[PDB]
Amino acid sequence: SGFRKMAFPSGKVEGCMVQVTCGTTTLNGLWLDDTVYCPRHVICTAEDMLNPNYEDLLIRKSNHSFLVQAGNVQLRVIGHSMQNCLLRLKVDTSNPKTPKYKFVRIQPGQTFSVLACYNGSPSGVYQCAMRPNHTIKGSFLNGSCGSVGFNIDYDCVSFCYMHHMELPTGVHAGTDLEGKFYGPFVDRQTAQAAGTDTTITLNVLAWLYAAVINGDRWFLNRFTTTLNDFNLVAMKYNYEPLTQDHVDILGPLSAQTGIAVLDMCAALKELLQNGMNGRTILGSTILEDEFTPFDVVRQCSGVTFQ
Amino acid sequence: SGFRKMAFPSGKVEGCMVQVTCGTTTLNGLWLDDTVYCPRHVICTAEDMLNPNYEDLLIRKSNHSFLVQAGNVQLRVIGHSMQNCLLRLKVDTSNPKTPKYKFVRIQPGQTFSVLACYNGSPSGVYQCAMRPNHTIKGSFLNGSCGSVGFNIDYDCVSFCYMHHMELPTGVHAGTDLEGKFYGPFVDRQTAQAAGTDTTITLNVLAWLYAAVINGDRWFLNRFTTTLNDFNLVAMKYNYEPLTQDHVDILGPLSAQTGIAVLDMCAALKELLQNGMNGRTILGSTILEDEFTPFDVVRQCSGVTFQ
Numbered sequence: 388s389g390f391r392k393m394a395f396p397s398g399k400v401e402g403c404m405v406q407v408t409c410g411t412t413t414l415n416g417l418w419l420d421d422t423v424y425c426p427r428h429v430i431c432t433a434e435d436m437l438n439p440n441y442e443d444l445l446i447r448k449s450n451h452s453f454l455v456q457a458g459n460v461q462l463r464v465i466g467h468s469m470q471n472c473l474l475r476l477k478v479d480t481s482n483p484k485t486p487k488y489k490f491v492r493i494q495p496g497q498t499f500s501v502l503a504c505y506n507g508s509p510s511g512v513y514q515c516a517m518r519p520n521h522t523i524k525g526s527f528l529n530g531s532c533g534s535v536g537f538n539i540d541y542d543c544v545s546f547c548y549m550h551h552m553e554l555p556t557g558v559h560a561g562t563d564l565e566g567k568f569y570g571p572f573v574d575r576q577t578a579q580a581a582g583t584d585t586t587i588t589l590n591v592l593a594w595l596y597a598a599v600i601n602g603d604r605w606f607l608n609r610f611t612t613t614l615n616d617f618n619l620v621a622m623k624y625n626y627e628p629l630t631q632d633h634v635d636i637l638g639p640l641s642a643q644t645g646i647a648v649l650d651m652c653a654a655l656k657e658l659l660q661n662g663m664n665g666r667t668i669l670g671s672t673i674l675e676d677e678f679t680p681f682d683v684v685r686q687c688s689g690v691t692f693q
Numbered sequence: 694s695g696f697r698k699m700a701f702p703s704g705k706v707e708g709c710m711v712q713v714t715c716g717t718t719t720l721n722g723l724w725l726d727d728t729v730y731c732p733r734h735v736i737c738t739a740e741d742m743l744n745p746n747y748e749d750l751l752i753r754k755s756n757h758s759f760l761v762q763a764g765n766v767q768l769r770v771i772g773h774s775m776q777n778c779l780l781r782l783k784v785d786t787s788n789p790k791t792p793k794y795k796f797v798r799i800q801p802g803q804t805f806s807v808l809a810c811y812n813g814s815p816s817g818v819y820q821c822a823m824r825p826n827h828t829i830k831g832s833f834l835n836g837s838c839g840s841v842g843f844n845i846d847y848d849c850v851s852f853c854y855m856h857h858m859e860l861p862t863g864v865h866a867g868t869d870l871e872g873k874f875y876g877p878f879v880d881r882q883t884a885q886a887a888g889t890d891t892t893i894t895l896n897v898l899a900w901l902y903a904a905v906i907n908g909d910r911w912f913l914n915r916f917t918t919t920l921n922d923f924n925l926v927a928m929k930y931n932y933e934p935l936t937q938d939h940v941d942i943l944g945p946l947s948a949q950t951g952i953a954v955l956d957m958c959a960a961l962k963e964l965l966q967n968g969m970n971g972r973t974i975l976g977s978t979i980l981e982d983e984f985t986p987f988d989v990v991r992q993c994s995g996v997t998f999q
């Protein structure tokens with residue numbers, strides 16, 4: 388049946404994207420009810436980006452220093468304030484397309500869909516995992532700030548990321564919708580680097596369960612392992628240590644496939660030690676770590692192909 | 694800056710998805726203006742699926758044999774007809790969310806976004822390439838028929854695929870929006886198999902150009918090749934032969950990077966013969982073939998990182 392990195396349908400979010408301009412700096416904003424949220428660096432000219440004092444830069448602006456465009460319609464700002472690294476612009480019109488929503492701060496290892504936008508116009512959508520080192524491997528160019536990440540449950544959009552910057556290694560950093568950065572990053576152009584990353588063990592196990600649900604068992608073996616012995620191997624291959632909470636989370640997948648978690652761990656230990664021997668799992672020649680246990684349950688059949 | 698398999702924002706398509714029921718069989722349909730399009734097998738009970746005579750099955754139905762639901766609203770069908778493998782149901786209401794659109798028959802090697810749907814409700818979106826053997830590697834479960842594939846240009850949606858079936862290897866087959874299948878497949882449950890597939894050479898070259906635009910040149914070499922000598926290597930590695938039309942298509946990417954197409958082919962020949970030596974290109978340990986030259990231009994910067 389297939390397994391793909393699948394994003395949530397983006398319609399409910401497309402109707403919330405607008406363009407925000409301050410002076411000659413322009414980026415995207417998120418319009419919910421009567422507020423527009425956007426990265427605070429929209430108040431910077433290129434020369435202010437190295438060491439901006441945002442409090443000092445913002446006090447010098449008025450409501451009319453901001454131009455907000457929703458399609459071809461201008462939205463008048465009637466208030467503004469700074470919340471951590473975002474600006475909250477109160478506008479005169481409430482967005483009629485506002486979906487049911489909430490703001491959530493996602494945890495490392497969790498995934499979400501990103502709606503890449505430029506000039507307030509959505510251009511593409513893809514799924515990202517929040518890496519253990521708090522960056523995402525996205526695809527963003529100049530003008531993409533203010534693009535958001537989100538998950539959808541029933542018809543409720545949980546926004547969890549707003550885009551602010553790229554680091555030297557080509558990876559990306561940003562904030563939750565309260566303006567607090569994920570990671571130790573700051574919205575300034577002083578030198579910064581992503582810390583060392585690690586493979587998301589829980590997700591790799593979830594994806595091996597997805598491969599068994601879809602009919603493949605070639606990588607299993609007759610062995611088992613203790614949590615500790617598995618972690619000695621994880622440390623060597625730069626995998627996050629497995630915890631009892633992770634074993635408990637994998638309970639439903641384990642039940643649907645009849646494979647004990649520690650037995651699946653013994654399969655993973657053997658794949659780490661011996662390689663894949665030129666074989667593939669769910670079409671991949673490497674161990675995938677950007678699918679959570681929830682992503683597997685969302686996408687795979689609830690009936691294993693025995 | 695990143696490179697991801699990026700789908701088009703799905704909002705314009707979500708507003709067109711509805712549910713279609715005939716008897717106890719239910720699948721998704723596409724509602725544009727006053728017509729609903731859906732796979733014709735919606736008229737089959739499970740026992741009719743092995744060898745249905747659709748003309749005979751359909752003449753036995755009336756307009757009220759069909760129940761069409763758009764959200765919580767029932768749409769009355771006032772006409773119906775069969776067009777190849779689809780049914781066209783005329784309904785009493787014109788879809789107010791109909792986007793500007795056209796129907797296109799995509800060619801092998803080209804890509805599109807799929808909006809997976811169940812019970813008329815969109816559940817996920819991802820990018821697919823039409824394989825040389827006319828199948829796609831999607832992710833579809835029971836109830837997903839009628840889901841569509843599309844590309845968006847400006848604000849025009851070009852629909853190009855409607856989903857009908859899965860083959861033994863886990864891959865998928867369907868039709869264009871005139872109901873004609875891509876490939877030699879038929880919408881019946883008699884044994885069928887996907888023919889042998891091939892790697893899409895043009896796309897692999899495009900993706901190597903994307904890697905150079907994004908700043909990486911490790912895989913280049915000082916050699917060149919003729920089209921013929923390259924094709925002798927392509928035949929051995931089950932790659933499609935490169936043609937002069939393919940070289941011409943790669944002209945803009947070649948100009949943006951200053952790398953002649955046949956010199957990039959010489960780089961590809963060396964990667965095929967020697968492997969990647971434990972290295973990655975755009976994060977991948979294998980040669981990716983699901984990005985077209987158009988997909989690279991759409992997503993990468995128009996300025997190479999020299």
Ligand SMILES: *[C@@H](CC(=O)C1CC1)[C@H](C[C@@H]1CCNC1=O)NC(=O)[C@H](CC(C)C)NC(=O)[C@@H](NC(=O)OCc1ccccc1)[C@@H](C)OC(C)(C)C
Nearest residue numbers: 414428527528529530531532551552553574576577578579
């Ligand atoms: C969004 C901004 C906008 O859309 C409009 C201007 C307001 C972008 C997104 C980047 C662009 C390329 N890909 C992206 O994701 N934001 C920014 O330009 C950032 C602005 C700050 C004011 C927050 N800057 C970067 O993303 C910047 N990063 C950076 O300076 O990091 C710290 C640092 C590391 C090493 C050496 C010096 C500083 C990027 C542009 O610069 C490179 C050189 C690191 C890629």
Ligand SMILES: *[C@@H](CC(=O)C1CC1)[C@H](C[C@@H]1CCNC1=O)NC(=O)[C@H](CC(C)C)NC(=O)[C@@H](NC(=O)OCc1ccccc1)[C@@H](C)OC(C)(C)C
Nearest residue numbers: 720734833834835836837838857858859880882883884885
């Ligand atoms: C959509 C149908 C609907 O959503 C509602 C019922 C009307 C599905 C989608 C499949 C389900 C699993 N993944 C998918 O993409 N369509 C169908 O069920 C197909 C119906 C025909 C009437 C067109 N059947 C298949 O997709 C069927 N394929 C098939 O029979 O192929 C030919 C064949 C090959 C080998 C041996 C015998 C026949 C699938 C269900 O069967 C398996 C066994 C090949 C997966």
